[PDB]
Structure 1
Amino acid sequence: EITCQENLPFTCGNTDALNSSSFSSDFIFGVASSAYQIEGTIGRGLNIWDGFTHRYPNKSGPDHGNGDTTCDSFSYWQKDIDVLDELNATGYRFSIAWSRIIPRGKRSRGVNEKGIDYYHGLISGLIKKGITPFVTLFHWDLPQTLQDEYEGFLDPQIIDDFKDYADLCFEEFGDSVKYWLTINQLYSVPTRGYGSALDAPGRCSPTVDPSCYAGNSSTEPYIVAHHQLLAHAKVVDLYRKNYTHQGGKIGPTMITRWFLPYNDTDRHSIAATERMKEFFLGWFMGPLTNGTYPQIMIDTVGERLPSFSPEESNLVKGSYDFLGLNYYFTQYAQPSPNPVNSTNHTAMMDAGAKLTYINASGHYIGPLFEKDKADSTDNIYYYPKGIYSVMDYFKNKYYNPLIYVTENGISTPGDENRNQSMLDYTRIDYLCSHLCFLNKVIKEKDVNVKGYLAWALGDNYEFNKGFTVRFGLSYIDWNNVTDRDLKKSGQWYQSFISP
Structure 2
Amino acid sequence: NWLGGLSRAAFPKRFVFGTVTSAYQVEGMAASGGRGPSIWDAFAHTPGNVAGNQNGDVATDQYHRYKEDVNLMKSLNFDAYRFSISWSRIFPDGEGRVNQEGVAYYNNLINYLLQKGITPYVNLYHYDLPLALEKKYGGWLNAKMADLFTEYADFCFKTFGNRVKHWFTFNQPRIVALLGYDQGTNPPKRCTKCAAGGNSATEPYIVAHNFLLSHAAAVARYRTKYQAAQQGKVGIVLDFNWYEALSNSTEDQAAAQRARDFHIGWYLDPLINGHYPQIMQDLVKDRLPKFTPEQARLVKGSADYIGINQYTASYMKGQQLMQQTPTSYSADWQVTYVFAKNGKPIGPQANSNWLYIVPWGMYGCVNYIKQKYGNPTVVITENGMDQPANLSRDQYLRDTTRVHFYRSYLTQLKKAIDEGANVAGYFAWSLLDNFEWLSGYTSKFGIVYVDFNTLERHPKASAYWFRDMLKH
Is the TM-score greater than 0.5?
yes
Question: Deviation per CA, 1:439-483, whole angstroms, max 9, x where unpaired?
Answer: 111112x111111110001010011110111000101111111x3
Q: Counterpart in 1 of 2:448? A: 474
Pick closer, same or farther for the CA change 1:340–1:153 going to 2, 3 Å: farther
Matched, 1:432 2:407: yes
Q: How many residues align?
A: 467
Residue segments in structure 2 that go unaligned for 5+ positions in a row: none
Cα shift at 1:489: 0.7
Q: Which of residues 332, 344, 356 is equivalent to 1:363?
A: 344
The answer to whether residue 390 in structure 2 is matched with residue 406 in structure 1 is no
1:131 maps to which of 118, 121, 137: 118
Question: Given residue 213 of structure 1, which amino acid in structure 2 is its aligned partner?
Answer: A
Q: Is 1:165 aligned to 2:152, yes or no?
A: yes
Find the counterpart in structure 2 of residue 75 from structure 1. Answer: 64
Partner Cα separation in structure 2 for residue 21 and residue 58 of structure 1: 49
Aligned counterpart for 1:38 among listed residues 26, 51, 55: 26
Is 2:40 the counterpart of 1:49? Answer: yes
Q: Contact 1:338–1:349 (CA<8 Å) still a contact in 2?
A: no
How much does 1:415 deviate?
2.3
Q: Is the 8 A contact 1:253 1:326 kept in 2?
A: yes
In 2: Cα distance, 1:303 partner to 1:246 partner: 41
| Bigger RCO of structures 1 and 2 (CA < 8 A, at least 6 apart) | 1
Aligned mates of 2:4, 2:363 — CA distance in 1: 22
Residue 3 of structure 2 is aligned to residue 15 of structure 1? yes
CA distance in 2, matches of 1:276, 1:354: 10
**Structure 1 residue 98 displacement after superposition:** 0.1
Q: Which of 213, 223, 226 is 1:243 aligned to?
A: 226
How far the C-alpha of 1:189 sits from its partner, in A, is 0.5
Corresponding position of 1:101:
90
1:59 counterpart SS class: coil
Quote how far apart the aligned CAs of 1:370 are.
3.2
Structure 1 unmatched runs, 5+: 1-12, 373-378
- SS of 2:315's equivalent in the other structure is strand
Deviations 1:30-56 (A, max 9, x none): 10000010111022110011111223x
CA distance in 1, matches of 2:357, 2:43: 29
Give the distance between the partners of 1:189 and 1:78, measured in 2 at CA: 31
Q: Is the contact made by 1:45 and 1:143 (CA closer than 8 Å) also made in structure 2?
A: yes
| Contact 2:41 2:55 survives alignment (8 Å) | yes
Contact 1:31–1:454, Cα closer than 8 Å, also in 2: yes
Q: CA deviation at 1:290?
A: 1.6
Given that 2:188 and 2:196 are in contact with CA atoms closer than 8 Å, whether structure 1 keeps it comes out as: no
| Alignment root-mean-square deviation, CA | 1.5
Q: CA deviation at 1:410?
A: 0.3
Give the whole-Å Cα distance in 1 for the aligned partners of 2:351 and 2:277. Answer: 32
- Is the 1:123–1:176 Cα contact (8 Å) retained in structure 2? yes
8 Å Cα contact 1:101-1:111 kept in structure 2: yes
1:63 equivalent in alignment to 2:80: no
1:139 aligned counterpart, secondary structure: coil
2:460 matches 1:487 = yes
Secondary structure at 2:437 match in 1: coil
Preserved CA contact (<8 Å) 1:83 1:484: no
**What pairs up with 1:328-407 in 2 under 5 angstroms?**
328-335=311-318, 340-341=324-325, 345-359=327-341, 361-370=342-351, 372=353, 380-407=355-382
Contact 1:46 1:103 in 2 (8 A): yes
Equivalent position to 1:201, from 179, 188, 200: 188
Separation (CA, whole Å) in 2 of partners of 1:172 and 1:338: 52
Deviations 1:425-451 (A, max 9, x none): 11111111111111111112x111111
Letter of the aligned partner of 1:329 in structure 2?
T
Distance of 2:323 and 2:333 partners within structure 1: 11
What is the correspondence of 1:269-284 to structure 2 with a 5 Å cutoff?
Answer: 269-284=252-267
What SS is found at the alignment partner of 2:114?
A: helix
User: Residue 48 of structure 1 aligns to which amino acid in structure 2?
Assistant: I
- Check 1:59–1:339 CA distance in 2 against 1; reply closer, same or farther (3 A cut): farther
Taking the aligned partners of 2:362 and 2:375, their CA distance within structure 1 comes to 16
**CA deviation after TM superposition for structure 1 residue 421, in Å:** 0.8
Residues 178-211 of structure 1: CA distance to partner in whole angstroms, max 9, x if unpaired? 10001001211011111111212211111xxx4x
- Paired with 1:76 and 1:380, the residues of 2 have a C-alpha distance of 30
Question: Contact 2:87–2:94 (CA<8 Å) still a contact in 1?
Answer: yes
Structure 2 SS opposite 1:168: helix
Q: Distance in 2 between matches of 1:475 and 1:117?
A: 28
Q: Quick one: distance in 2 between partners of 1:397 and 1:289?
A: 10
* Percent identity of paired positions between Structure 1 and Structure 2: 41
Q: Match of 2:170?
A: 183
Distance 1:184 1:346 in 2: 22
Determine the structure 2 residue equivalent to 1:462: 436
Cα distance in structure 1, aligned partners of 2:222 and 2:140:
20
Query: How many Å apart are 1:371 and its aligned residue?
Result: 5.3
Structure 2 Cα separation of the partners of residues 335 and 247 of structure 1: 46
Looking at structure 1, the residues matched to 355 and 385 of structure 2 have their Cα atoms a distance apart, in angstroms, of: 11
Matched residues in 1 for 2:172 and 2:20: separation?
Answer: 14
